[PDB]
Amino acid sequence: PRAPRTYSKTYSVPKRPYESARLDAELKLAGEYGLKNKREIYRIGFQLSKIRRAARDLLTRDEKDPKRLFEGNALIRRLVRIGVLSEDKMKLDYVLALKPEDFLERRLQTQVFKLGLARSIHHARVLITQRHIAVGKQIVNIPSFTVRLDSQKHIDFAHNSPYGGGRAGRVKRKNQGK
Amino acid sequence: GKVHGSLARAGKVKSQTPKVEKQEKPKKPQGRAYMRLLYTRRFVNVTLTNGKRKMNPSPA
Amino acid sequence: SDAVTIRTRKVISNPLLARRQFVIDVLHPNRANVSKDELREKLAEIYKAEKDAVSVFGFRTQFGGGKSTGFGLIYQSVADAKRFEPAYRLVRYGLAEKVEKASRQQRKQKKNRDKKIFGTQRRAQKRAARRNAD
Amino acid sequence: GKGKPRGLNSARKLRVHRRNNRWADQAYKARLLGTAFKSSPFGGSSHAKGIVLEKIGIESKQPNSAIRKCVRVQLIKNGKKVTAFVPNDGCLNFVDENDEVLLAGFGRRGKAKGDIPGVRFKVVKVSGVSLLALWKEKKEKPR
Amino acid sequence: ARGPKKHLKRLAAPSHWMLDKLSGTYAPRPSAGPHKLRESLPLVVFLRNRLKYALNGREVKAIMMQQHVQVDGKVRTDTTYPAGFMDVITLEATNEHFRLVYDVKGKFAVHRISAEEAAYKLGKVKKVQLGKKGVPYVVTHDGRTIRYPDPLIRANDTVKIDLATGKIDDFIKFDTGRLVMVTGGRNLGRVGVIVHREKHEGGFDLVHIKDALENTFVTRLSNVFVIGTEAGKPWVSLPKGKGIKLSISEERDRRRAQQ
RNA sequence: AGGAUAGUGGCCUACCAUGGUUUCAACGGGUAACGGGGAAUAAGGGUUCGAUUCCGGAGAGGGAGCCUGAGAAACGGCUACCACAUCCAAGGAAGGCAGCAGGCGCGCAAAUUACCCAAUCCCGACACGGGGAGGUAGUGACAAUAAAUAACGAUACAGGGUUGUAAUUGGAAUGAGUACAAUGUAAAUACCUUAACGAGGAACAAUUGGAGGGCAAGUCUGGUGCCAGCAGCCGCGGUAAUUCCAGCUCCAAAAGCGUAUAUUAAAGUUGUUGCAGUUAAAAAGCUCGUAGUUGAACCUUGGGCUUGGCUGGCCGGUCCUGGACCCAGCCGAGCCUUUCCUUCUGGCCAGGACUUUUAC
Ligand SMILES: [Mg+2]
Ligand SMILES: [Mg+2]
Ligand SMILES: [Mg+2]
Ligand SMILES: [Mg+2]
Ligand SMILES: [Mg+2]
Ligand SMILES: [Mg+2]
Ligand SMILES: [Mg+2]
Ligand SMILES: [Mg+2]
Ligand SMILES: [Mg+2]
Ligand SMILES: [Mg+2]
Ligand SMILES: [Mg+2]
Ligand SMILES: [Mg+2]
Ligand SMILES: [Mg+2]
Ligand SMILES: [Mg+2]
Ligand SMILES: [Mg+2]
Ligand SMILES: [Mg+2]
Ligand SMILES: [Mg+2]
Ligand SMILES: [Mg+2]
Ligand SMILES: [Mg+2]
Ligand SMILES: [Mg+2]
Ligand SMILES: [Mg+2]
Ligand SMILES: [Mg+2]
Ligand SMILES: [Mg+2]
Ligand SMILES: [Mg+2]
Ligand SMILES: [Mg+2]
Ligand SMILES: [Mg+2]
Ligand SMILES: [Mg+2]
Ligand SMILES: [Mg+2]
Ligand SMILES: [Mg+2]
Ligand SMILES: [Mg+2]
Ligand SMILES: [Mg+2]
Ligand SMILES: [Mg+2]
Ligand SMILES: [Mg+2]
Ligand SMILES: [Mg+2]
Ligand SMILES: [Mg+2]
Ligand SMILES: [Mg+2]
Ligand SMILES: [Mg+2]
Ligand SMILES: [Mg+2]
Ligand SMILES: [Mg+2]
Ligand SMILES: [Mg+2]
Ligand SMILES: [Mg+2]
Ligand SMILES: [Mg+2]
Ligand SMILES: [Mg+2]
Ligand SMILES: [Mg+2]
Ligand SMILES: [Mg+2]
Ligand SMILES: [Mg+2]
Ligand SMILES: [Mg+2]
Ligand SMILES: [Mg+2]
Ligand SMILES: [Mg+2]
């Protein structure tokens, strides 16, 4: 038959379901970034948990090792590229010091509110879902879309959106046409 | 075990529980809105009694 | 508003099949999309070819609309196009008539029915008729 | 010298000694002896259907005092007779003699739970309809 | 298994064809021919996956049935014909001549050559022995049988085939210092000179090869194809990269500057 | 020695020896056993699984035997028997879904008797035919990805330095859905695009489990009263039950949530890493002893000389970057020390002759 298509899980749940010293921390963190549910918080911890695992393995090798130099710098370059890692912290020891708020900072939902295009963070998510925001010349409706540094400057309203020079929406057309 | 007994009393308490209807209360928000509701309720306007915090305070 | 804009990339000249082949980018803001028939007319104007030597297919509109990407063929002649084209595309363009045949079940059942006869059908049916004395 | 052999060429003794001694793990014996396959009423399955033989009722263990309302069920797959608890307030009235019931374990993985003696199964469905659906009036018994 | 296999599952095809997983259930099974199944390139892959001249399998059959494709100076119409190393493909409609030489990345490069170089080819001598009536003959890597060879020619040597008459123009004796391309193993496609031939009676002889960068690697004698009389003097034009293997860090650096 | 085979061979025959395997586990039995690539969990070491997208193997109800052919002990080929089983005019004849779809049965357990060769490839005398192989759709909460179920303002209060909410008041925004249409396709469906339609209780209404502890969240109200029931475990019910049945409120995860079973970690409760054995389970009553396991020390060390490469610097020779000279440090050589380092021809590469066996 046809070749199988690969797929994988993108999150992992806590070992202890009920622990206030984490439930409150998660909710405080979800409220700050306007997240829908706890799984969007589990997802950040999962990808940060395997980056740490990758970083530990390269750090055990000797310096100037070919694998440590190639993959460590490449992973760092991508992290600087998405704006998570600062240009003065490319040492793979500050990589271990990263925290989940660094990744939620680079989401499209976080950047739209923080760019002044929205009144609040919950306004940012609904603007994205309702096809109002375009990055470059492409409409993006994914709130978790991670903004790159070179794409940061090109965040604005969609060219055919009511708020960005487009036509009037469905509701307004119903009132002014009567 | 020595096992038997009258089967006549099945459902005794549930049958005689007086049926009480649920008041037709407003719907709760779903998704992102409900997490927003809980966050303020636990970190913005905290209702603590001098360190004394209750999620479901009985009317006492 | 309308402003249909056509860009061609990955152009390959293919004298093996007597045609030129390329990728088509269509920019159509304030327009749902452009029909293949309308794309074929415009291509004839741009490249000074007969409309019947031009073939487009496999179009998909990007997210948010306003742009589509597809594949296009331009043959050196209409005769060359008629030789090196799938039947279904010529039927799409009106250069051929859709062939009419029974369903696959009917062809297969008929094929297996003829398999029980050795020789001509005329011999088989006259002789089978002879058996049924009625 | 810690009692077990340590020599570099004593792998056969180490492999056999562990192999002999894992039989002391009761969980391990049941997996290799196939006791669930041989002795368990379900034959290793998670669930099993059967026919209700009789409504009886089981006296609870001390210090509790109650009548746990069960049924006697004959399994379709192997003809064995088992006792199955009927959970919730008044669900025994949903189960009649010569009804088809779907069973599952009590969750203690072959042992009895609580004060119910010698009962290791619970009723999940009757006549192909969930007992919980019958209890909460989501569905009605097909009869 | 009651008889020969006639299908090739997509996942079981040779990896150097660079076929995608999800395009279908099956892959083109190369026909019997001058080159081994695992070491060949079917003509369907070249015209559609490599040149991307054909859009599908229907189109490659239409191209070849009009007599356009020639391999080694004869028109071939077998869509799964196993073209291999040193084979010449001619498309006179497009006026293009190709030679199948491995690039250093292990794949068959799309290497266009001039018509002057496309008029001959090289073949590695597998065996020299006497035929019927005591006529000596040479078997090259593509199954050609050439009679009456130069009596100095031995196995593992490379001969220059006229490719129009099938005769031997001249040859290169197998010895230290000859230019070599590797036709097997993980060093496939690398180009260097023989440094040391390591003999093992009853086993596999090993050849020591020096890169143009004085990098040393070892490969089996069955993977050695003599292509030149000395360093820097190949008898055919090499593909882009000249068969020199770069490390991934050098490749990343090389890609960074070319942009 | 022969015969047979495509061919080696006790493969078989004739004659002849008495050999062959085995406690380093032969042989036999079991396997809820097709092998592997691989899967789940995983600090490490491990434990468990792999019928199933690829490779190899085996079978076509069970056996056995064959024809044709290069290739079959083939089964959508045949012959015979066994078990099933079909038509019959009673003389006879004909069967093989562990192919696709479908039916019965079995069960805890699994979808359409649909469209097409357009793609992927295969077969043929072949540019043309065929292909339930394969592709398309249908059923489909197996799993997997993203991700709606609302957002922003004004009043009115409260409030804290300038704004976070608790109520009743507005106008905006959008896709779920619908649909001209175009795209998609062999033809369709759907997706993606997109006119018009399509949101105030925005009834376009999120559920599943819980609220004594483990374990996050009630000593609220009513009902029952060792009954009914709950309760994985400890425990809860005899009149204000924090645990039942309900209502309210609250907690947890959410298009998902619970239950049963198996399995992995937790388990240093299988322990090589890494358990325990006086009394909690556990040193054979005591010696000998074969196999197994395991076994004291000892044979070229030191010194001297020359050289290759790279780290810190001084030099700095700075466009983060490069030199002899110098210091320490690190890796390799090449000679001499009574000197292992096989031995010869063309003259370190190619052509001859020798070599204690291993483990690492
Ligand atoms: Mg909490
Ligand atoms: Mg016929
Ligand atoms: Mg187990
Ligand atoms: Mg077993
Ligand atoms: Mg007890
Ligand atoms: Mg049932
Ligand atoms: Mg050839
Ligand atoms: Mg013999
Ligand atoms: Mg023989
Ligand atoms: Mg014998
Ligand atoms: Mg068996
Ligand atoms: Mg088996
Ligand atoms: Mg497998
Ligand atoms: Mg297995
Ligand atoms: Mg398998
Ligand atoms: Mg099985
Ligand atoms: Mg297979
Ligand atoms: Mg077979
Ligand atoms: Mg069968
Ligand atoms: Mg057979
Ligand atoms: Mg069959
Ligand atoms: Mg068959
Ligand atoms: Mg036959
Ligand atoms: Mg079937
Ligand atoms: Mg199922
Ligand atoms: Mg069905
Ligand atoms: Mg086809
Ligand atoms: Mg299929
Ligand atoms: Mg599809
Ligand atoms: Mg699900
Ligand atoms: Mg909803
Ligand atoms: Mg719709
Ligand atoms: Mg519709
Ligand atoms: Mg349109
Ligand atoms: Mg609830
Ligand atoms: Mg608590
Ligand atoms: Mg009360
Ligand atoms: Mg009371
Ligand atoms: Mg009370
Ligand atoms: Mg309480
Ligand atoms: Mg409780
Ligand atoms: Mg309650
Ligand atoms: Mg939640
Ligand atoms: Mg572990
Ligand atoms: Mg311990
Ligand atoms: Mg212990
Ligand atoms: Mg004692
Ligand atoms: Mg001994
Ligand atoms: Mg010693």
Side-chain angles (χ1 to χ4, degrees):
Chain A
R2 207 204 53 196
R5 193 192 288 266
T6 314
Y7 65 84
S8 66
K9 182 172 71 183
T10 63
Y11 73 105
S12 73
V13 307
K15 257 311 196 310
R16 301 158 164 268
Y18 311 115
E19 197 190 299
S20 292
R22 185 188 48 80
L23 286 176
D24 283 9
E26 286 165 3
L27 181 55
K28 192 162 168 297
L29 185 62
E32 175 175 347
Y33 295 102
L35 307 180
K36 170 176 181 244
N37 60 48
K38 301 297 186 71
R39 192 198 316 198
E40 291 181 321
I41 297 161
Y42 301 160
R43 173 169 59 197
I44 297 301
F46 174 45
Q47 50 183 153
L48 189 58
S49 166
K50 83 172 302 181
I51 282 167
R52 293 177 146 176
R53 171 176 315 179
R56 220 192 326 179
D57 292 331
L58 306 175
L59 279 184
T60 59
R61 293 175 179 276
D62 190 359
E63 183 143 26
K64 301 289 202 175
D65 184 291
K67 182 165 194 172
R68 161 168 180 168
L69 292 179
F70 185 44
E71 302 200 332
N73 290 342
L75 165 69
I76 289 170
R77 182 209 79 104
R78 315 190 251 108
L79 288 168
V80 167
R81 181 198 205 180
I82 58 181
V84 164
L85 190 71
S86 178
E87 280 75 358
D88 61 357
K89 292 177 165 177
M90 308 187 244
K91 297 298 293 295
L92 202 73
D93 290 331
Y94 300 108
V95 170
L96 296 186
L98 287 172
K99 282 178 308 299
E101 308 78 356
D102 301 302
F103 285 83
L104 299 100
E105 277 322 329
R106 304 302 309 161
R107 301 174 88 236
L108 191 48
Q109 152 186 27
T110 301
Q111 288 311 305
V112 174
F113 164 64
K114 287 190 100 180
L115 281 196
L117 303 172
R119 314 274 71 74
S120 67
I121 191 135
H122 303 269
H123 186 215
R125 184 180 294 274
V126 297
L127 275 171
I128 292 173
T129 302
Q130 288 167 122
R131 319 184 35 152
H132 293 296
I133 301 302
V135 186
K137 34 188 179 292
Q138 164 74 275
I139 297 170
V140 181
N141 79 329
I142 304 306
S144 53
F145 176 102
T146 297
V147 186
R148 289 180 187 153
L149 278 192
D150 50 83
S151 297
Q152 182 145 231
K153 312 302 174 182
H154 306 335
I155 304 183
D156 211 313
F157 287 87
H159 40 270
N160 71 29
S161 178
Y163 306 143
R167 66 200 321 279
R170 186 180 61 158
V171 175
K172 177 167 285 185
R173 287 189 331 257
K174 199 191 183 191
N175 288 61
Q176 81 181 33
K178 85 181 174 303
Chain B
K2 207 262 180 216
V3 152
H4 56 107
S6 179
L7 296 174
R9 307 186 292 276
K12 162 180 167 303
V13 161
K14 192 190 172 47
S15 78
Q16 64 183 177
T17 302
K19 180 115 174 66
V20 175
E21 295 256 7
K22 293 181 176 118
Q23 290 80 16
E24 184 178 1
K25 65 179 72 66
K27 111 170 182 185
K28 307 179 180 175
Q30 306 286 332
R32 179 206 31 84
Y34 196 65
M35 293 295 172
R36 181 195 203 231
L37 176 66
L38 297 184
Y39 168 71
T40 71
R41 270 165 58 181
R42 293 192 211 170
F43 299 102
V44 175
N45 48 287
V46 188
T47 192
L48 74 165
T49 313
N50 194 359
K52 222 64 185 66
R53 183 176 181 217
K54 270 298 186 296
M55 294 215 173
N56 190 19
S58 318
Chain C
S1 59
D2 276 325
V4 165
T5 296
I6 294 162
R7 314 199 167 128
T8 65
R9 58 183 221 268
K10 297 255 194 162
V11 183
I12 277 177
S13 197
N14 191 18
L16 307 182
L17 288 160
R19 77 187 180 201
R20 193 150 27 86
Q21 63 185 81
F22 42 84
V23 178
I24 292 171
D25 271 321
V26 188
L27 303 76
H28 51 84
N30 291 15
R31 172 172 266 294
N33 44 90
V34 193
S35 316
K36 291 185 287 288
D37 186 74
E38 177 173 357
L39 292 173
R40 286 165 70 228
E41 306 155 320
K42 290 199 163 56
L43 269 173
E45 213 180 38
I46 293 179
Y47 299 99
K48 297 181 289 188
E50 272 285 328
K51 190 209 182 190
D52 282 5
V54 183
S55 185
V56 302
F57 52 90
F59 279 123
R60 179 188 148 87
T61 315
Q62 292 181 356
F63 185 104
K67 187 192 182 60
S68 284
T69 316
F71 203 86
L73 308 168
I74 292 176
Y75 290 88
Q76 278 220 36
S77 66
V78 186
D80 282 7
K82 285 165 173 283
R83 180 154 59 111
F84 298 125
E85 211 60 19
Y88 76 92
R89 293 178 224 175
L90 299 173
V91 183
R92 279 187 203 170
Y93 309 147
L95 306 188
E97 310 308 308
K98 175 56 171 185
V99 64
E100 268 293 329
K101 41 162 174 185
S103 195
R104 278 189 105 232
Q105 296 293 119
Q106 315 291 13
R107 270 144 47 211
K108 291 172 159 195
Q109 279 167 64
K110 176 212 83 187
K111 180 252 295 178
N112 286 290
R113 274 190 311 261
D114 292 331
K115 283 211 293 186
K116 304 182 168 195
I117 293 155
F118 179 82
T120 313
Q121 303 273 345
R122 184 178 20 189
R123 171 191 199 76
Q125 65 204 170
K126 293 186 297 178
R127 286 183 49 97
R130 170 264 316 178
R131 262 311 312 134
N132 290 2
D134 85 332
Chain D
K2 232 179 181 172
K4 51 182 157 187
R6 277 210 195 107
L8 200 64
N9 293 14
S10 62
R12 89 177 328 115
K13 181 67 180 294
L14 292 173
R15 175 174 47 90
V16 168
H17 187 251
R18 174 61 46 236
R19 178 218 290 162
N20 288 331
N21 280 270
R22 294 183 69 188
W23 288 107
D25 187 332
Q26 89 175 28
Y28 171 87
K29 276 167 212 177
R31 170 156 43 85
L32 280 79
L33 294 192
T35 61
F37 201 71
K38 274 281 194 309
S39 296
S40 87
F42 278 15
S45 304
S46 53
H47 297 65
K49 278 177 197 175
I51 304 298
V52 176
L53 298 179
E54 58 175 356
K55 295 214 286 185
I56 172 177
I58 297 170
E59 293 179 353
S60 61
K61 282 190 170 181
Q62 284 290 4
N64 284 323
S65 90
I67 297 298
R68 304 294 169 219
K69 296 241 177 31
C70 313
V71 286
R72 288 293 295 184
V73 182
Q74 185 167 38
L75 298 183
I76 297 266
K77 71 196 293 182
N78 47 350
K80 293 180 176 176
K81 286 167 194 167
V82 303
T83 314
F85 180 57
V86 183
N88 294 327
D89 208 328
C91 292
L92 188 63
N93 306 326
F94 293 128
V95 181
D96 292 337
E97 271 92 58
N98 312 312
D99 256 331
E100 184 178 1
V101 285
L102 177 74
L103 309 186
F106 230 80
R108 289 207 73 203
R109 302 174 301 101
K111 43 213 147 303
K113 153 185 164 308
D115 52 27
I116 300 169
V119 174
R120 318 185 295 166
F121 313 97
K122 72 180 227 185
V123 167
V124 173
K125 293 163 71 119
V126 64
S127 293
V129 174
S130 166
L131 209 55
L132 200 71
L134 292 177
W135 196 56
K136 304 163 103 45
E137 291 85 328
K138 284 171 166 287
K139 296 192 181 54
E140 293 83 329
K141 197 173 159 180
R143 191 76 269 158
Chain E
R2 296 173 46 214
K5 290 285 170 336
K6 293 152 167 149
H7 289 69
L8 187 57
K9 297 272 182 64
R10 177 64 63 86
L11 278 191
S15 313
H16 67 269
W17 297 354
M18 295 183 288
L19 295 184
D20 56 332
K21 308 193 310 187
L22 304 185
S23 177
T25 289
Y26 302 103
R29 191 181 175 85
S31 308
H35 298 93
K36 287 178 158 299
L37 189 79
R38 201 64 49 174
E39 317 161 332
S40 77
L41 185 71
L43 293 175
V44 62
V45 177
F46 185 70
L47 284 174
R48 175 193 56 188
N49 304 63
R50 286 308 162 280
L51 299 186
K52 294 180 176 172
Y53 278 18
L55 205 179
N56 61 326
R58 205 206 59 242
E59 271 175 18
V60 64
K61 183 107 190 173
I63 291 172
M64 294 178 70
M65 283 303 319
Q66 31 174 357
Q67 300 297 289
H68 292 195
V69 183
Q70 299 180 10
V71 185
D72 288 342
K74 296 109 190 169
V75 170
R76 301 223 212 267
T77 63
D78 187 298
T79 179
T80 55
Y81 182 89
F85 189 58
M86 284 282 159
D87 281 336
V88 175
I89 299 184
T90 300
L91 311 86
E92 45 270 19
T94 68
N95 194 21
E96 290 172 317
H97 307 167
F98 306 131
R99 176 164 267 130
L100 281 72
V101 286
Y102 295 118
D103 61 67
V104 67
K105 267 299 160 45
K107 279 76 155 177
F108 270 126
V110 180
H111 182 46
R112 328 151 188 280
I113 63 181
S114 62
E116 306 145 346
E117 193 202 328
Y120 67 105
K121 87 176 286 181
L122 279 70
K124 170 174 167 181
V125 176
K126 305 301 177 183
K127 56 175 60 177
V128 181
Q129 64 183 12
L130 263 70
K132 283 317 189 179
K133 285 161 154 44
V135 172
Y137 64 79
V138 172
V139 185
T140 69
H141 78 296
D142 50 347
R144 278 174 194 266
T145 291
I146 297 153
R147 305 215 301 173
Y148 299 117
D150 202 301
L152 283 185
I153 297 182
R154 290 293 176 274
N156 303 308
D157 297 340
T158 299
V159 293
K160 173 169 174 190
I161 310 300
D162 180 72
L163 186 63
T165 66
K167 301 315 210 314
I168 293 176
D169 299 350
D170 60 319
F171 61 90
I172 304 166
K173 225 298 191 192
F174 184 78
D175 204 5
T176 302
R178 293 310 202 276
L179 199 51
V180 173
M181 185 180 288
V182 188
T183 60
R186 39 171 269 148
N187 291 296
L188 191 139
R190 300 183 76 171
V191 178
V193 299
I194 298 168
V195 160
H196 181 27
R197 174 187 171 169
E198 195 194 288
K199 300 203 164 199
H200 292 290
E201 305 185 344
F204 310 93
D205 285 16
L206 300 169
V207 180
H208 296 255
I209 304 162
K210 195 134 61 53
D211 207 337
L213 262 52
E214 289 84 4
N215 295 332
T216 313
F217 51 96
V218 186
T219 191
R220 272 182 188 183
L221 179 49
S222 58
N223 296 323
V224 165
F225 198 108
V226 192
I227 72 174
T229 180
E230 73 153 357
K233 291 208 169 304
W235 275 16
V236 293
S237 62
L238 289 189
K240 172 176 50 60
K242 307 203 170 188
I244 300 158
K245 194 163 168 190
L246 311 93
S247 77
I248 52 179
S249 59
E250 295 141 19
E251 296 182 336
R252 177 205 62 211
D253 297 337
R254 199 75 48 181
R255 313 205 162 84
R256 286 271 143 123
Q258 42 178 182
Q259 77 183 264

